[PDB]
Amino acid sequence: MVSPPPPIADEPLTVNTGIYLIECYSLDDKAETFKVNAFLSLSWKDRRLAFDPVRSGVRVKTYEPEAIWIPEIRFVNVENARDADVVDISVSPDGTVQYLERFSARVLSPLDFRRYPFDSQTLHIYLIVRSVDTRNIVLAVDLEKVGKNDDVFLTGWDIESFTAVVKPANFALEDRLESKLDYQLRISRQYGYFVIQTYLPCIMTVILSQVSFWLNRESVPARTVFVVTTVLTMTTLSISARNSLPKVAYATAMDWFIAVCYAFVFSALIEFATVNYFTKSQPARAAKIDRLSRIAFPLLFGIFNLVYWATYL
Amino acid sequence: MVSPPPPIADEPLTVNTGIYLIECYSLDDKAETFKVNAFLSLSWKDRRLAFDPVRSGVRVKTYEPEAIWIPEIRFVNVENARDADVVDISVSPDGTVQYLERFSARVLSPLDFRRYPFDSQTLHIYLIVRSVDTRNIVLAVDLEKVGKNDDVFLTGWDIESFTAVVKPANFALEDRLESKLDYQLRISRQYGYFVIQTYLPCIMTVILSQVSFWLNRESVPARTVFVVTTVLTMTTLSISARNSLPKVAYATAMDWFIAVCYAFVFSALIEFATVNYFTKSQPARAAKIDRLSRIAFPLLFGIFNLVYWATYL
Amino acid sequence: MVSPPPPIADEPLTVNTGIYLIECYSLDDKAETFKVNAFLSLSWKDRRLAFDPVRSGVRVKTYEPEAIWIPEIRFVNVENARDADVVDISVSPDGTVQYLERFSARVLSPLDFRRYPFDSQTLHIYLIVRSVDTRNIVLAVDLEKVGKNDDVFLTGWDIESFTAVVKPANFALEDRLESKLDYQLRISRQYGYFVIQTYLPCIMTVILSQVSFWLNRESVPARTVFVVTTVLTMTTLSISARNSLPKVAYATAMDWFIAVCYAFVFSALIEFATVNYFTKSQPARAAKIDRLSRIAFPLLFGIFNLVYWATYL
Amino acid sequence: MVSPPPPIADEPLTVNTGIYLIECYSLDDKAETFKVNAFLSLSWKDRRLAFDPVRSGVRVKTYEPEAIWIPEIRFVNVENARDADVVDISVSPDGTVQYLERFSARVLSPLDFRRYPFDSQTLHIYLIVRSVDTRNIVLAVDLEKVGKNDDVFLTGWDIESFTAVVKPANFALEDRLESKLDYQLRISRQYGYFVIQTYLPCIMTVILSQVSFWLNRESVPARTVFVVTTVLTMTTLSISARNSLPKVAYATAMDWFIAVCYAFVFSALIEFATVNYFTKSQPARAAKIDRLSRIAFPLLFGIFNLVYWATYL
Amino acid sequence: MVSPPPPIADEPLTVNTGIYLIECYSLDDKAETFKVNAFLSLSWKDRRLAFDPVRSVKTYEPEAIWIPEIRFVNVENARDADVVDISVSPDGTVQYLERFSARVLSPLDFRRYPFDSQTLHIYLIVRSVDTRNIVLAVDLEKVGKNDDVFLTGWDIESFTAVVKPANFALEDRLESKLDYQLRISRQYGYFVIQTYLPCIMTVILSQVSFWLNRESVPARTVFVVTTVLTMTTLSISARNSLPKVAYATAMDWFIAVCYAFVFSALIEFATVNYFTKSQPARAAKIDRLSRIAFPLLFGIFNLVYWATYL
Ligand SMILES: C[C@]12CC[C@@H](O)C[C@@H]1CC[C@@H]1[C@@H]2CC[C@]2(C)[C@@H](C(=O)CO)CC[C@@H]12
Ligand SMILES: C[C@]12CC[C@@H](O)C[C@@H]1CC[C@@H]1[C@@H]2CC[C@]2(C)[C@@H](C(=O)CO)CC[C@@H]12
Ligand SMILES: C[C@]12CC[C@@H](O)C[C@@H]1CC[C@@H]1[C@@H]2CC[C@]2(C)[C@@H](C(=O)CO)CC[C@@H]12
Ligand SMILES: C[C@]12CC[C@@H](O)C[C@@H]1CC[C@@H]1[C@@H]2CC[C@]2(C)[C@@H](C(=O)CO)CC[C@@H]12
Ligand SMILES: C[C@]12CC[C@@H](O)C[C@@H]1CC[C@@H]1[C@@H]2CC[C@]2(C)[C@@H](C(=O)CO)CC[C@@H]12
Ligand SMILES: [Cl-]
Ligand SMILES: [Cl-]
C-alpha cells in the first residue's frame, strides 16, 4: 500500500509507540551490550481502512502486515536489526490501526563505570522513523502501553524503573525528517558480590603486609617474604579486578581502593627496608619506626575504610 | 484464517498442550540458561474442519499449516523465538485438530545458588497464548502428552521429574487476555565433582597451614613460607571458586566452607605471629600456645567439617 | 503429495538408510558434542511413481523433492535440526525412489571419561521416523550406503569403525509408532599428548619432592621451599587437569595418577615435618627416617608407575 | 530488469555512493575486525524511469527493489555478505533513482601495532561494483551522503574523521572491469588504560628490584627473593601483555618498554650475583658496586623514562 | 532443467573451474580451520542455450538454466554464495561466476612448528547425474588471489591447483574432485619472543646459582626451584596453543632440552650441597666444571638447533 494521506494536507502522521519488557538478559559489562525481548506496540490512524460499524457486521476486523501500509520503525542503538514476530493487527471502525509485535534485540548502550562497582546506569533504547515523501511521520509515547513484566531480572542488578521520554527528538538526516524516542531503563549495580571478590582479598592482604612490623627485625627473610608476596598479591588483584571492565580511560572507585591499598603495602615495603637499613646502626630509630608503623598503619587504614565505605554507600 | 467461532457463543477455546523432552543440554550456570529440544503438541476443536468420514474416503485427512488456522503459541522465558519443524497435523471427522511440532529453544531460567553446590532447581518453561478479538483462548495440559525421553541427561545433574501445573495463569496484558502454563523440570546437582575441585584443596591447605605449629619456633622463615603460602592459596581458591558462578548477591554453602577455612588459616597466621612475638621473652607462653593450638585447631576443624557435611548431606 | 499406499494393505513401508561420513570435526569433550558432515541416502518403494521401462524410453527419471512424497527423517540426539542440501533423487521403473542429500549437524553424544585419558567411546547418531495415519513406517540399514571417507580425521583420536545396528528400535510415542536406528562411531583417544601435558609435570614434581630428603636437615628453609612448592605444584596440576573435562561425578585414570602423586608429595611433607620434629632430640631417629625414605619413596613410586602404565596400556 | 543503456552509447554509468555510520562496536584487536551499522545510499540515472511531473501528479514516485534494476554493490574487506534492509527508493522525473538501505557488517581490516599502544589506525571499508556486459559501471562518492552519528563511540578510541577517497580504483578482474572505493575511518587509541594495566606494574617491579641494593649484603636469601621474584614478575607481565595482541611479527612500543625493564631487572640480578661473589674476598669492591648502583640505576631509569614518554607522547 | 545431453552420446561433460581468493582470515591452529572468501568461476558447454548471434552474450538467472551442483568437501557447512554473473556464448558456452565465503577444515603438520610450512587444501567435488558423467578441470585464467590477501601470522607463498582431477566411484556414482593448494609458511618471530627467550633466560637464571656461596643454601634453593617451575609453566603454556597432537614439535624439543639443563642444574646443586661438608674439594670441583660446561653445552645446543631449524 501507500502511506496515509494527510487530512489537513500539511499534518504530520504521529505513531503512538509503546514497549513492554518481557525478558532482559545478557548484560555484558565488557561489550556494553544487553539483550532484550519485549512487546512493541504502534498505533495510528488510516481512514482508508475505516468502515461503517453497522453496515459492516464486524466490530474490528484484522489485517495481515502485507495487507496494509505499516510504518518502518527502526531501532538506532542495536547491533543487528531486531527479530520480530507480528502478534496482532486490529483496525477500528474509524480507521485506527493497533499493531503489536514481539521482538528480541541486542542493544548497545555505553555504561558509566566511574562509580563502579557502586554505579547506576541508564540503558537507552532509541526508536526512530524516517519520513516518506508523501507525509512526515512523528513518534509519540502511549504511556498506557509502556511497562515491564514483574519477572524481569538482571541477576547482578536492581531494576529501578522503565520509562520513556514523551517529547521525541525530531531532526534532519540525509534530507529527510527523522523522529527518535528515548526509552530509558534505570538500574543500579549490586556491589556486594565484589566486596567478597576483590575488597576482602585486598583488605586481608593489607593486614598480612602489616603483620611484618611485629616480626623480629633480625629475621630479614621472613619479613621479606611477607612484604614481597603481599606486594605481588596486591598487583595481581589490581590487574584481575581491572580485567572485568572495558578499556575505559578513567578510574573506578574500585581502582581507587586498590590503588590506596597498593600505597599502604608498598609503604610497608619501604618501612621494612628502612628499618632493616637502620637495624645495626641506630637500633633505637628502627625500633621507634616499628612502633609508629604499628600504630599509624592500622589507624590510617581504618580511617580510610571509614571515609571510603561512608562515601560510596 | 481466523479463530474458530464459539458454538455456545460465549465459550472460550481451550488449547490442549503437551511437551515431550527429547534433548536437554547446555545448562549454563553463569548464564542461567539451558537449551531444550522437544515435541510440542496442541489439540483443539475447529468444527469448520469437520467432514464426512464416508463421503470423504479418508479417516483423518491432514493439512499444511498454511491451510488452516493454528493458534499463535509463544514461549515466555526464551531468548529468541523457538525454531520449530511441524511434524504432523491431523483433523478428525468432528473437526478436532491435532498439531504436533518439534522445536529447539534456549530457555532462560534463574537458579537459586544459596545451597550450592548442594542445590536443587526447578527449571521453568512458560507457555503462553494471547486471545484474539473474535474469541478468548485458554491453555490446558494433556497429561497423556507430557513426559521426557529416557536418554535425556544433564551432565552435571540428576533429573528428578518433569511435570506441569494443570491450572493456568490467566491475566490481562495490553488490553488482551493471556493464558500461561508452567512446565517444571526438577533437577538436583551432583556435588561430588566440586568435592575434588575445591573442598579438597581447601582441607589440605588448612592441614598444611597447621603443620607449621610443629616446626621449631626458631626457624622463622620455614613457618613464614607455610603460613603465607597457605593464606595466598586459600585466597586463590576462594576467588577461583566464586569465578564459576554468576554475580549472585547471597552466599553459597561453598562460600561458607571456604570462608571458615580462611578463618582457620588466617588464625594460624595470627598464631605464628603471636608465638614468634613471645619466643624470646616468655618462651613458656609461646610453647604453651603451640601446645594448645596443636589440639584445638584440628579438633575445631573436624567438628566444623562434621556439622557442615552432616548439614548439607 | 501423500505417503505411498501399501500393496499388502497391512504392510509397513521400510526406508533403507545409509550415512557416509565426509568430515568429522569439533569433538568437544566438555560439551560432549561433535560436528559431522556426511551423506544421507534413503531408498523406498512408491508404486505411484512406477512406469513402463520400455514404453518410457528413460532408464530412471529423476524428481525434485517437492515433486514426490519424501519421508520425514529426523535425528534424535542433535541440538538443532540438521542443515541438508538435496543432492539427487532417482526413481526406478518399478517405483523405487533413491534420495541422496548432504547434511551437516552438531550431534550430542555422552562420553565415558572413567578410563580417561585411556578411554574409548561410541558416539551415537540416532535416526528416527514417525508413522503417518495412512501407513506405518519402519527404518532399515543399507550397508552398501554406510562408510566414511579415508581422509576423515578427529585430531587427537584414532577412528576405529563406523557401523549401524541393523535391527531398529520401534516403539510407541504419543500414540504413534516411531522407528529409530543407531549409527555408531567407535573411537579411541590418543593419550600420548597428555603424557607430556600432565603426567611428566607430575612425575618430575614427585622427584623434586623427593630431592628434599638429601638436603642437610639443618637447612630447614630449603626443605620447606621444596616440600611446600611441590605440594602447591601438585594441587595446580590436579586442578588444571580436571579443568579439561565436564563436571563428571566419577574419577578418571588421570585423576587417580594425580591423586597418588599428591599422596606421595604430602607424605614427603609429613616426613620432612617429622624429621624436623626429631632433629634436636634423637638425631639418630631423624637420620634413620631420611635413610629409609631415600630408598622407599622412589621404589614405591617406581612400582606404582609399573602397575599403572602396565594396566592402562 | 537490465542496466540502463548509455545515451552516448559509450558512456559509463556512475553510482553515487554514501555511507553514514550509525553504530560502531566490537573492535577486536586480535581478530583485526570490527562491526559496523550504517546507511548505504546509492544514486544513479535510469531514463527508463523518467516521467512527466505534470501529467503524473506525483513529484517523485517510489519503487520496490524488485520492480527496477539495482546495481550489485558488494563490500570487499568483509567476512560475510552484508545484511541490508532497504529503507527507501525514490525516483525523480528525470530518471534519477535514490536508494537507501541500512546495513550491518563485520569488516576485516588490518591494524599497524608498531606504535601500540600509542597507535593511530585507518580502518578501511572498500566498496566495489562489477561491470555487466551491457554497460560498464563506475563508483563515485556523494560527499553529502557521508558522515557518522554523534553518538558513535569505540569504547577505547578517539574517532578523528570519516571520509572517502573520491578517485576510485578501477581495475581488471577475471576479464571484467571492477570499481572500488575506499572509505576511511581514522581513529587513535586511548593509551591511558595500559598505563595502569602494564606500565605501572613494570615500573613498580623495577623499583622493587632496586630495593635489593639497600639490604645488608650478608642477608643473601632476602636479596635472592627480591631479584628472582622481580625477574619472574617481569617475565609474567611481558607474556601477559603480549597475550592481548595478534601474532604480529614486529615489536610494539610497549614491547620495547617491557624489554628495557627486563634489562634493568636482569641487570639487578647480575649485580646481586657479582656483589655476592665478591662479598667474602674484597668486600670493598662489593660495597663500591652497591654504592655506585644505587645512584646509576635510578638515574638511567629516569632518563630512559624521559626519552620514552617524551618520544611516544 | 536437466543436464546437457552429450553430443558424442558417450562423452563426459567437463566443467572448467577457477577460484580467485579475495579474503583469507581466521586461521585457527587449534581448530585446524581457516575462513576464505573468494570467487568461484565455472565454465561449460550447453548447446541447448546456443543461439544465432545475428538473428539475436545474453545472461540468465540461475533458476532459468541447468547449473552443475558443485560442492566443497573439506568444509563445515555448505558455503554461502551470491551469484554474480551468468553469460552464455553463441555456441552455448556458459560462464558462471559467484562469490562465496566458507570455513574450510584442513589439517596442519606441527612437527616443524613453529618453523612450519603448510599446504591448506580446498577440495572441489561434483557428483555425476544419471543422464551424463561430469568431470572437473582447471581454467588457469580463473585462478589467483588478490594482492591485499593476508594471514596476520603467515607468509603466503603461492596459490595453485592440481590440474589432473581425482575421479572415483562413490555410492554408485562417478565423483570428480579437484585439489586447490594454498602454500604458506609461519612467521616464527612472535614465538621467538614469547617462549624461546623466557626459556633461555630461565636457563641462564638457573645457571646463576652455581656462583652463589655454597653455604647460602636457601638462595640457591630459590633459584633452582623457581627456575624449574618456570620451565614447567612455559612448557605447558606453549603446548596449550596447539591441538592435542600425538607427536612432538621443534618447540617441544627446545623446551625439553631447556628443562633437561635446568633439572640438571638442580641435580648439580643437590650433589654439591651433599658433598659440601665431607669432601669440599669435590663440591668445589663440581662447581668449577659446571660453570664452564653448562653455558658451553647450552651455546653449542642453541647453535645446532637454530642452525638446523633455519
Ligand atoms: C627510593 C629508593 C631510591 C630510589 C630507587 O632506587 C628506589 C629505592 C627503593 C628503596 C629505598 C631507596 C632510597 C633509600 C631507602 C629509603 C633506604 C633508607 O631507609 C635510607 O636510609 C631503605 C629503602 C631505600
Ligand atoms: C592485628 C595487628 C594490629 C592491627 C593491624 O596492623 C594488623 C596486625 C596483624 C598482626 C597483629 C597485630 C596486633 C598485635 C599482634 C597480635 C602480635 C601480638 O600478639 C602482640 O602480643 C602478633 C601479631 C600481631
Ligand atoms: C597431622 C598433624 C595432626 C593433625 C592436624 O593438626 C594436621 C597436623 C599436621 C602436622 C603433623 C600433625 C601430627 C604430628 C606430626 C606428624 C609431627 C610429628 O611427627 C610428631 O613427632 C610433625 C608434623 C605433625
Ligand atoms: C653470565 C654467567 C656465565 C654464563 C652463564 O653460565 C650464565 C652466568 C650467570 C651468572 C654470572 C656468570 C658469569 C660470572 C658472574 C658475572 C659472577 C661474577 O661476578 C664473576 O666475578 C657473578 C654472576 C656470574
Ligand atoms: C635421584 C634421587 C633418587 C631417586 C629419587 O628418589 C629421586 C632423587 C632425587 C635426588 C637425588 C637422588 C639420588 C641421590 C642424589 C643425587 C644426591 C647425591 O648427590 C648422592 O650423593 C643429591 C640429590 C639426590
Ligand atoms: Cl517461542
Ligand atoms: Cl556486502
PDB file of C-alpha atoms and ligand atoms in Angstrom, chain A residues 206-215 293-299 301, chain B residues 266 269-278 285 289, ligand 2:
ATOM      1  CA  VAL A 206      46.990  -5.229  53.565  1.00  0.00           C
ATOM      2  CA  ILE A 207      46.660  -6.710  57.055  1.00  0.00           C
ATOM      3  CA  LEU A 208      49.044  -9.507  56.057  1.00  0.00           C
ATOM      4  CA  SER A 209      51.517  -6.885  54.844  1.00  0.00           C
ATOM      5  CA  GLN A 210      51.158  -5.143  58.219  1.00  0.00           C
ATOM      6  CA  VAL A 211      51.939  -8.318  60.196  1.00  0.00           C
ATOM      7  CA  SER A 212      55.573  -7.832  59.150  1.00  0.00           C
ATOM      8  CA  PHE A 213      56.013  -4.936  61.597  1.00  0.00           C
ATOM      9  CA  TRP A 214      55.732  -7.369  64.539  1.00  0.00           C
ATOM     10  CA  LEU A 215      58.347  -9.890  63.385  1.00  0.00           C
ATOM     11  CA  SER A 293      54.226   1.991  61.844  1.00  0.00           C
ATOM     12  CA  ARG A 294      52.454  -0.453  64.179  1.00  0.00           C
ATOM     13  CA  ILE A 295      50.172   2.349  65.419  1.00  0.00           C
ATOM     14  CA  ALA A 296      49.814   4.561  62.328  1.00  0.00           C
ATOM     15  CA  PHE A 297      49.158   1.927  59.656  1.00  0.00           C
ATOM     16  CA  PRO A 298      46.055   0.172  61.064  1.00  0.00           C
ATOM     17  CA  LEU A 299      44.684   3.546  62.209  1.00  0.00           C
ATOM     18  CA  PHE A 301      43.726   2.200  57.199  1.00  0.00           C
TER      19      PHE A 301
ATOM     20  CA  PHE B 266      44.455 -16.651  58.912  1.00  0.00           C
ATOM     21  CA  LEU B 269      48.950 -16.910  60.711  1.00  0.00           C
ATOM     22  CA  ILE B 270      47.996 -14.860  63.770  1.00  0.00           C
ATOM     23  CA  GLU B 271      49.101 -17.770  65.961  1.00  0.00           C
ATOM     24  CA  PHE B 272      52.506 -17.958  64.270  1.00  0.00           C
ATOM     25  CA  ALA B 273      52.876 -14.194  64.709  1.00  0.00           C
ATOM     26  CA  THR B 274      51.973 -14.378  68.407  1.00  0.00           C
ATOM     27  CA  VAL B 275      54.318 -17.304  69.097  1.00  0.00           C
ATOM     28  CA  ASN B 276      57.140 -15.549  67.251  1.00  0.00           C
ATOM     29  CA  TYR B 277      56.355 -12.374  69.208  1.00  0.00           C
ATOM     30  CA  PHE B 278      56.659 -14.228  72.541  1.00  0.00           C
ATOM     31  CA  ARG B 285      53.950 -18.836  76.884  1.00  0.00           C
ATOM     32  CA  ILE B 289      50.360 -21.596  72.731  1.00  0.00           C
TER      33      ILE B 289
HETATM   34  C1  LIG F   2      46.202  -7.035  64.487  1.00  0.00           C
HETATM   35  C2  LIG F   2      47.578  -6.380  64.265  1.00  0.00           C
HETATM   36  C3  LIG F   2      47.437  -4.869  64.512  1.00  0.00           C
HETATM   37  C4  LIG F   2      46.488  -4.186  63.524  1.00  0.00           C
HETATM   38  C5  LIG F   2      46.951  -4.392  62.097  1.00  0.00           C
HETATM   39  O1  LIG F   2      48.192  -3.714  61.884  1.00  0.00           O
HETATM   40  C6  LIG F   2      47.120  -5.867  61.796  1.00  0.00           C
HETATM   41  C7  LIG F   2      48.041  -6.565  62.801  1.00  0.00           C
HETATM   42  C8  LIG F   2      48.275  -8.028  62.456  1.00  0.00           C
HETATM   43  C9  LIG F   2      49.322  -8.641  63.380  1.00  0.00           C
HETATM   44  C10 LIG F   2      48.950  -8.490  64.857  1.00  0.00           C
HETATM   45  C11 LIG F   2      48.661  -7.018  65.200  1.00  0.00           C
HETATM   46  C12 LIG F   2      48.385  -6.823  66.697  1.00  0.00           C
HETATM   47  C13 LIG F   2      49.465  -7.427  67.595  1.00  0.00           C
HETATM   48  C14 LIG F   2      49.725  -8.906  67.282  1.00  0.00           C
HETATM   49  C15 LIG F   2      48.506  -9.762  67.670  1.00  0.00           C
HETATM   50  C16 LIG F   2      51.027  -9.523  67.869  1.00  0.00           C
HETATM   51  C17 LIG F   2      50.848  -9.917  69.323  1.00  0.00           C
HETATM   52  O2  LIG F   2      50.429 -11.000  69.672  1.00  0.00           O
HETATM   53  C18 LIG F   2      51.230  -8.859  70.361  1.00  0.00           C
HETATM   54  O3  LIG F   2      51.194  -9.518  71.612  1.00  0.00           O
HETATM   55  C19 LIG F   2      51.338 -10.715  66.940  1.00  0.00           C
HETATM   56  C20 LIG F   2      50.593 -10.432  65.618  1.00  0.00           C
HETATM   57  C21 LIG F   2      50.059  -9.001  65.780  1.00  0.00           C
END
